[PDB]
Amino acid sequence: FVSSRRMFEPRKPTVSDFVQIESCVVTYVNLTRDQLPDVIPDYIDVNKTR
């Protein structure tokens, strides 16, 4: 869930809401190809659509 830090406004995540980062860190939740759409309903699997 994503919410304003000031105001609790829980919300589902968005693909555009995120940015890629060069390096992972130990605090990043582990995730897989299949899991990412589960976390992000907005995900687009180009490999599968192709």
Ligand X SMILES: *[C@@H]1O[C@H](CO)[C@@H](O[C@@H]2O[C@H](CO)[C@@H](O)[C@H](O)[C@H]2NC(C)=O)[C@H](O)[C@H]1NC(C)=O
Ligand Y SMILES: *[C@@H]1O[C@H](CO[C@@H]2O[C@@H](C)[C@@H](O)[C@@H](O)[C@@H]2O)[C@@H](O[C@@H]2O[C@H](CO)[C@@H](O)[C@H](O)[C@H]2NC(C)=O)[C@H](O)[C@H]1NC(C)=O
In the complex, which residues of this chain contact ligand X (CB under 6 A)? 26, 28-30
Q: Residue 50 is encoded by which pair of tokens?
A: 């192709």
Q: Which does 35 bind (CB under 5 to 8 A by kind): a copy of itself, ligand Y, ligand X, none?
A: none
d(CA 9, CA 11): 6
Nearer to ligand Y, 20 or 49 (CB): 20
Fill in the per-residue mask, 24 to 43: x = in contact with ligand Y (CB under 6 A), - = not in contact: --xxxxx-------------
d(CA 39, CA 41): 6
| Cα Rg of the chain (Å, integer) | 13
Binding residues vs ligand Y (CB under 6 A): 26-30
